[PDB]
Amino acid sequence: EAVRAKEVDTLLSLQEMAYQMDSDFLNERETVVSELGASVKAERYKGMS
Amino acid sequence: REIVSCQAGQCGNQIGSKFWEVISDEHGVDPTGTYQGDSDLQLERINVYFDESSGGRYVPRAVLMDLEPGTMDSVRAGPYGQLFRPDNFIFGQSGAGNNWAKGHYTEGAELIDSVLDVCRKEAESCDCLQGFQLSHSLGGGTGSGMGTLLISKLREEYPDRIMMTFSVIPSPRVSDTVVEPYNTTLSVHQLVENSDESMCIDNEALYDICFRTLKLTTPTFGDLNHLVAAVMSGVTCCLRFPGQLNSDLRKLAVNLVPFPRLHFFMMGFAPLTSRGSQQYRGLSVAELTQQMFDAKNMMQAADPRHGRYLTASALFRGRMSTKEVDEQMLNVQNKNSSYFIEWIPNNIKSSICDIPPKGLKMSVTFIGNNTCIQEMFRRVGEQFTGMFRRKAFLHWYTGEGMDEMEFTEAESNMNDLVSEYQQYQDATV
Amino acid sequence: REIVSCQAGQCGNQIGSKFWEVISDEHGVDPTGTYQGDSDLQLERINVYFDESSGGRYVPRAVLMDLEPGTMDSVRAGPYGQLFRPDNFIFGQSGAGNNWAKGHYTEGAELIDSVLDVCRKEAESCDCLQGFQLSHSLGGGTGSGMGTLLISKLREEYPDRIMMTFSVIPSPRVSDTVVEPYNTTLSVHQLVENSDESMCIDNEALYDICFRTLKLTTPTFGDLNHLVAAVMSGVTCCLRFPGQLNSDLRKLAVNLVPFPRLHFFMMGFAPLTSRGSQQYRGLSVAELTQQMFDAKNMMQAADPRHGRYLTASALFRGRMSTKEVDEQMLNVQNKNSSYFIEWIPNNIKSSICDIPPKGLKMSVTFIGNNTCIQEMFRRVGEQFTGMFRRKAFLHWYTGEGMDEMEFTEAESNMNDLVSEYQQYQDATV
Amino acid sequence: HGSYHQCECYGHDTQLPNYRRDISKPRTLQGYYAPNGGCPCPPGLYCSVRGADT
Amino acid sequence: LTTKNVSIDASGVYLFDNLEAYPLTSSQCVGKMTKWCDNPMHKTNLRIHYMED
Amino acid sequence: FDGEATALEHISFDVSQPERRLWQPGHATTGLEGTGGGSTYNGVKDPW
Amino acid sequence: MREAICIHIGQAGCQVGNACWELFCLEHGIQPDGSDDAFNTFFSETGAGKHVPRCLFLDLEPTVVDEVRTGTYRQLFNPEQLVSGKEDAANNYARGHYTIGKEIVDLALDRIRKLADNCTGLQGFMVFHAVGGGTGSGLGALLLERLSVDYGKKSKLGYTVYPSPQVSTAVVEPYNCVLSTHSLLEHTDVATMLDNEAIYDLTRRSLDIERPSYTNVNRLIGQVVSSLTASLRFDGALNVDLTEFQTNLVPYPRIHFVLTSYAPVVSAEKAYHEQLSVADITNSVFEPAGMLTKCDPRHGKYMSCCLMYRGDVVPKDVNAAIATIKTKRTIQFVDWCPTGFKCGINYQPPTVVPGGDLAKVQRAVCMIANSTAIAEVFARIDHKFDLMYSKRAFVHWYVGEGMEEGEFSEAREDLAALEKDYEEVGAES
Amino acid sequence: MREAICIHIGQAGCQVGNACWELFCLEHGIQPDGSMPDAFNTFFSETGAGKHVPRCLFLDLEPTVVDEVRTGTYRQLFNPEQLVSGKEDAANNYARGHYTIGKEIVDLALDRIRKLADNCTGLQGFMVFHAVGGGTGSGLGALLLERLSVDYGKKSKLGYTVYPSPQVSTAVVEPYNCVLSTHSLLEHTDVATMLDNEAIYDLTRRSLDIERPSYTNVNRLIGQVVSSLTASLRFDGALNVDLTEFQTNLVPYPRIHFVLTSYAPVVSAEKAYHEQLSVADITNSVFEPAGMLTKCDPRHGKYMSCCLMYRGDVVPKDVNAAIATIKTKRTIQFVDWCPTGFKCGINYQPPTVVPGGDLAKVQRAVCMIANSTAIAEVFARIDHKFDLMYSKRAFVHWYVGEGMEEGEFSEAREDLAALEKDYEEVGAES
Ligand SMILES: Nc1nc2c(ncn2[C@@H]2O[C@H](COP(=O)(O)OP(=O)(O)OP(=O)(O)O)[C@@H](O)[C@H]2O)c(=O)[nH]1
Ligand SMILES: Nc1nc2c(ncn2[C@@H]2O[C@H](COP(=O)(O)OP(=O)(O)OP(=O)(O)O)[C@@H](O)[C@H]2O)c(=O)[nH]1
Ligand SMILES: Nc1nc2c(ncn2[C@@H]2O[C@H](COP(=O)(O)OP(=O)(O)O)[C@@H](O)[C@H]2O)c(=O)[nH]1
Ligand SMILES: Nc1nc2c(ncn2[C@@H]2O[C@H](COP(=O)(O)OP(=O)(O)O)[C@@H](O)[C@H]2O)c(=O)[nH]1
Ligand SMILES: [Mg+2]
Ligand SMILES: [Mg+2]
Ligand SMILES: [Zn+2]
Ligand SMILES: [Zn+2]
Ligand SMILES: [Zn+2]
């Protein structure tokens, strides 16, 4: 069960790396947007598309 | 056990929008309002921040406030903007004019009745109100003025209720306002009198933590508000989720506020790393503590090494070992005696929540009542005194009927705050 | 038993990059940090130089320092450059200008804040830090200035912790700098107080070794760095691998430093042979010792025949017992009594490790505190006085806050070290 | 002074003016032009070795 | 014709239609961190402390 | 490399200032192409 | 809602209004027939489906009004709101204020009343005139005082064109300017300088225009007006309003005469040869050569700058430019205004007027900067006034129209009081 | 970063800059129109449109060469600004170029320089290419050097100056001009670089074997030298050095910073592939007075500090062997108080040849920037001409009628005499 705990910790760590790498916040991408938000970007405006 | 939140002004509304984004994501709530979670724990304590509707929708217990209506289209244009009640949107024709006088006495007063009506609606529908939360910036007109007015009226009917205020203290280097010192000074005394506790978030510090630690090239206002949203989500984690050592806003206030006027804290979040440095970081407490107590992690631009920690609070979230989360704090207290006040032993309170934030295995939020909070109040106090000495920009405040004495009164109260921080820092056993 | 490493200047950065190349090759680590070794003995003590992320990637515990970001870019783009932490590289806007004053007082002193931040992070993350490691060149600006400043401000924080420095002592025969004696003199007196033991490297001797022993037609900085890296890996063979007669850095200091000021060693490696003579050379430990005490095999350009060995240390690696590591030491002690010191019986300590460097079935690293090590200190002394008397190239140093008194004190301290070496060389029982 | 002649000796000054005190002061008829000036309408070898004064 | 037209402008015209004349460069010392050095947030001096405080 | 030859090929028939080339052309056969029908004194493309 | 009534007075007002409404129609996609409500501040949505400008073209000389009535935007312009007189003021302040102005303001206020009733959230009035002539100065003064006495504390923005310090198309122009300064100081919330020599210099230098004209001058004026109004027209991180930047710009009620500047203002050939970054454009703004008024700020002290950024400008680059300006000593901010900076962000780049001289640009910035250097032009104009009034030149023209001789003395003395006020605000405490 | 603003003053500076920037564009793969079909940050700046703009300020008092550049091939490369041309030339008069017509243009030049520097976040310094013989390059060069020194503080200043050679001289008053500009070159210039013309002419006549080489050829050689100097901070190499490193390794005293230049191997296409151009051979040619761009005989003085920029496939083996051979060569001698006296910097980039040029494709090269006491003799020739001209007031009315007084000449002569004296003193043995 100690070996199991180490395996689970490693798997969760890899999941953390994957999520942080694909995260919108860290990658400056707006994956989720609304009908109004597509036209108007007051806070999320990063640069010209 | 459930709290009701209010966002004031442009900055407050935009911060609260993404705060509700984080809360809904963590509770498995759709941007529309329907529940789409995969765990019972998500729905177990969803009443803390949400109220169930007629059709099963989950509406945030949130009151949106702004004298400027031109910026409250963006709050509903955000991805989760259609989550709020239409009747919780309170607007005025003209903006606050970046005027604390307009936001507190003339324009805010005509708008505060409906806001208090909505807040009383939320409180009455609320079963056992744990507290009122507020998100605003002290450098604005309807954020500082109307927010202080709101908390002042809130104390009139809820004295013992926890008044959270995530005040955004504007910084001179990232400044974009000239009446900045005036609004900050006029709001600081109201914050002292009408807030059980008030954490200070500085835009300079947010920009720095996004620039160095995150290293991401373009942290905009949304990216700055992301960290504040994460801190708000982590400060109430134990109210919504089970934990080995849970807590709530009152319990943190009791363990962090030694004297009634000393309720200004420093916020920190962990872990925060860049995209490139992601492979290279170890995910454990022996790394979370480093980031949390690190100088650059604070969201306030005044380095905690100035003074000594009165109290510290560590809201850890995730799968931790309780002795490994407490002996780290024992080690830091053991080995950093110079930055912890001697006459208050065991300054650090650690609390454990079982469920971490969504997408994170383990994290921690930091609340520090360090005596370095006087640094921001000073560096804006010299600016305010320089502005006031030559009577600069006082007609814009005296045209609303507000008299020149209240500037001196606010200066006196703010100087008293700074002086009591300094005296308690220099206190000896 | 942790060793936390640091590289200063472009020379030190290249040497450290090659050192991590050698260590990763020995421990079975790809440039991406993954482990593909043939035995678990690598992971048994992999911690000594690498840290493991929660994802399993092994990251060197190294801190890189250079006021020029070009060196950081080159190291990162090197074959093993993706191994280091992205935030473990620290860079400045403007280079040291090959000036000890710029690297130690004005520009280097500014960047040592972040250097110490990352260095303390890494040093604390160690379960039990055995020592610090440094690689630099005293003939440059960043390595000579910032390296000595780092060792000075690290001695204050870790007093009893062991302090490795590999300083590339420049020589006029391979001269490529004219502020060479100034920088060397200004760094020697710092290393005397701030380093518990320090062995010197001369490109003259490395080039000579490559030309006559390895018989390389076009020896390069890569080859010199590979030699230095192999021997710097061998100095910690007992630390990283089990052996018959274990040793550590503190043990090396205790058995090689008779007096606190005398810690400047001359060093070497074995076996070394040309490409065309590898299959003809009978690798026996007697031959290993013969090459080990051969004057030409020393990688610091000073003939031991003009001095006497205060102490010597032979870290042998491979399948081998104790008489090839002690009886030939007795033989060399007896047949070179004029080359050793009478009042120190058993001048040579031997250590045994069970894991030889790969590609060899047995090897040895030599570290000698010979009294001839002060010949370079002589020659650099009159070199320094040559420009100091005429005040040549001194305005660059004096314009960055330094004064002539510092130069006089540095020369006096170097001369005192020289006199101590000479008097202990010619001292009688 | 020394054997090498100074910039002021040549007739040119490598000194930054005090903008806070002198340069950034606006010019008006009353205050500058009246005491020690004219109207706002549109319009050396100093060697210390020799008799000139730096 | 100008002497510059004969030499310099002629060389430029040759370079226009002969792209192989450009020699390969190895600017490995210039990289992502050197570009990051140029980020304008450096001049903002975020969370910086002086003697004046 | 025939510098004079390539100069005759390209620089001699190059135009640096087309404004001047149109305004005062000599024995130049390049750059004379201007706006097609844009400039009529009548001010209208219609017939006079 | 958020309307803005544009009142153009006199010939100069008429041409600048033509250019401004051309630019506004181009920005909002409005054909010269009237064919998201970003247009609401400038174009009232007629009940017939078209868009009528919220403007009043007022002129005593019928020539320019008839030219507008018979131009290209006939179907765009209301047949009223287009008031025409029968004879001009003949470059006489007395004729424009006491004789012909009195008999036309009676209906001008009726037209403004109709415009105000059409408006619902009127932010204020933008007046466009040159005080050089009679209608611009005299009728402008009369209209300004009637608006002040009728609409109370509605915002007023007089984008006035004072006589340029060197060239002038009149001889009684200093007289008219000195007579109108009383109204421009008493019944104008913010007065902006739009002299002609500076715009000529930008057109000649930055635009490489050999023969600049009133066309180009009016195009630049319209560019500036659109840049300032686009904060309430369009989106942005930091949206500001008229009263917003009045509060953030005007420190004293008497201190409201403000300078303006625009960058980048370059031609098509120039545009693609430069890095038109935020830092570059801000530096071009703060340089004297980039101002629309011949008044060097470095000759005075900055008191309050309001930067208006349009395009891809980020608050990041705004703060970076602000930092590199504060750290810059060639421009001195006044001691009682530490921050001194207001920032507005806009997410629509300025649409270029075809057939002009501006080039398609991804980002632009307009600075409304109140500084103590404004005393230079006032000293210029009252020196002309004293020179001409020393022996009573052209005074019979003013006297015979019903304006007494003490007018000149009182107006000159009000201007001298303004001299003293602008000296005193900039003088160090 | 590691930007370096190239300021070209006068006709000589403008043409030298033309050669330098064609070589830089060729090296960085930039079309003469400014586009590419990022070490160029040190010399070129990007744009939203995707083209590159050089970090140069061409400045002339007269519009001939500037307008010829505007009408040349590189017109699209060069920015319309940063190409400042006045209305009338200084007319070979230091007084006219420094007091009458340079005053009305130095403000615009400084504004352009500030605009260029605002885009540079790590600007190492300014390389000013000029000839002090001409009126513009002397007067306006000195004025701009002053204003740059007072505007940027202690920023690095590499003044590549073309002194008038003792025998060949295209002007009669350029001794006056150089005597007047020696103050600027002596105070407001961090490192002054001698680029006289006869030495380059002789090097090209013998080592390159072309009958009629011209200003284009000498400017190509100067651009090659400048590119060799800057390649250390542009490209890779075993020993990377910057503009702030060789100044420290080259200048022993703040006021002793006049240095000679030399280059090797300068060979033709015929000579390229017949000799084994080893590093030892090229270093020997460099130390030989034949390989120099300025005719200060090594034996007549003593080297104080030699900086050697090697480019190409040079290994430190050969560099160290060449250094050892040079040290053991008794024909040349170093100053007594500087034992090492050698600064070495190796760059991996091989020398780049411009098509239509006169150099040949060589896989290795070396450039020397040498501070030696032998440089006093060019000043000796200069003031031996100056006092002969100045004995009875020859060509002095032209100067005194343009703003400068009679004391300027005498004070400049005293400065030159002190420049003789301190060089003799540092050459004197201890
Ligand atoms: N920028 C700009 N200024 C103008 C224009 N036309 C006139 N002016 C200014 O007007 C001043 C002289 O006044 P006028 O041209 O007579 O116009 P006015 O002020 O309305 O006076 P009246 O013609 O009597 O009504 C000059 O100094 C100009 O600066 C224009 O088209 N553009
Ligand atoms: N090496 C080199 N020197 C040049 C070149 N062109 C001009 N010179 C130098 O310029 C000197 C003559 O000065 P001038 O004819 O006045 O030219 P200038 O120095 O630019 O001064 P101005 O003509 O006033 O601009 C000669 O002695 C040359 O040494 C060139 O292309 N290469
Ligand atoms: N961190 C953060 N700060 C903001 C945001 N929006 C505005 N601010 C800050 O708030 C200040 C402007 O205050 P404002 O929102 O206009 O106050 P209000 O007028 O009362 O709404 C600026 O100086 C900004 O630095 C935001 O989304 N995030
Ligand atoms: N062994 C070895 N020595 C080197 C290497 N690179 C440079 N050096 C030596 O370092 C000295 C110059 O150091 P320098 O670059 O000025 O140090 P810095 O100023 O701190 O960057 C020279 O004498 C070289 O002999 C290398 O890769 N390997
Ligand atoms: Mg008119
Ligand atoms: Mg000329
Ligand atoms: Zn000078
Ligand atoms: Zn006058
Ligand atoms: Zn003098």
Side-chain angles (χ1 to χ4, degrees), chain G residues 5-190:
Chain G
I5 293 296
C6 289
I7 311 163
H8 325 277
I9 308 171
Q11 184 178 2
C14 281
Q15 284 95 23
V16 303
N18 269 322
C20 282
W21 285 115
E22 183 178 1
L23 173 60
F24 298 154
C25 275
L26 271 156
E27 293 179 353
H28 294 290
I30 301 296
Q31 313 301 326
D33 63 358
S35 65
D36 186 74
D37 53 28
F39 62 94
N40 200 293
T41 195
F42 277 134
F43 295 84
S44 64
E45 190 277 331
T46 300
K50 66 165 54 54
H51 305 102
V52 165
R54 306 178 192 274
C55 69
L56 171 78
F57 280 76
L58 181 41
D59 203 318
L60 298 178
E61 178 83 359
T63 318
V64 289
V65 182
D66 290 331
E67 190 276 331
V68 172
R69 276 203 277 265
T70 60
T72 307
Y73 302 84
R74 314 181 331 281
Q75 313 303 160
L76 168 76
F77 286 129
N78 197 0
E80 69 275 16
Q81 305 175 358
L82 206 45
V83 176
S84 178
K86 292 181 181 179
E87 281 96 340
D88 63 358
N91 265 16
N92 196 358
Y93 182 93
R95 294 201 41 120
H97 193 275
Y98 297 100
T99 74
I100 306 149
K102 182 67 181 294
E103 72 188 319
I104 190 167
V105 291
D106 62 358
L107 71 83
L109 277 296
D110 291 331
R111 303 293 150 79
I112 296 298
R113 178 71 274 172
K114 279 171 69 173
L115 264 63
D117 306 302
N118 198 0
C119 295
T120 175
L122 176 58
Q123 303 254 310
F125 305 81
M126 301 193 222
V127 183
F128 303 86
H129 67 270
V131 304
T135 314
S137 71
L139 196 147
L142 178 47
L143 194 62
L144 269 169
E145 65 183 1
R146 304 301 270 281
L147 276 295
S148 70
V149 75
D150 282 330
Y151 293 119
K153 288 186 176 181
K154 274 322 211 193
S155 178
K156 264 172 271 293
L157 299 97
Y159 292 164
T160 195
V161 179
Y162 284 177
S164 55
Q166 282 283 43
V167 305
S168 66
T169 65
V171 302
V172 287
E173 181 158 4
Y175 273 19
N176 299 315
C177 178
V178 169
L179 284 171
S180 50
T181 191
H182 155 266
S183 76
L184 201 53
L185 165 69
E186 201 66 11
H187 317 102
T188 305
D189 293 359
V190 163

Side-chain angles (χ1 to χ4, degrees), chain D residues 39-41, chain G residues 380 383 387:
Chain D
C39 64
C41 298
Chain G
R380 179 71 275 172
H383 181 280
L387 265 186

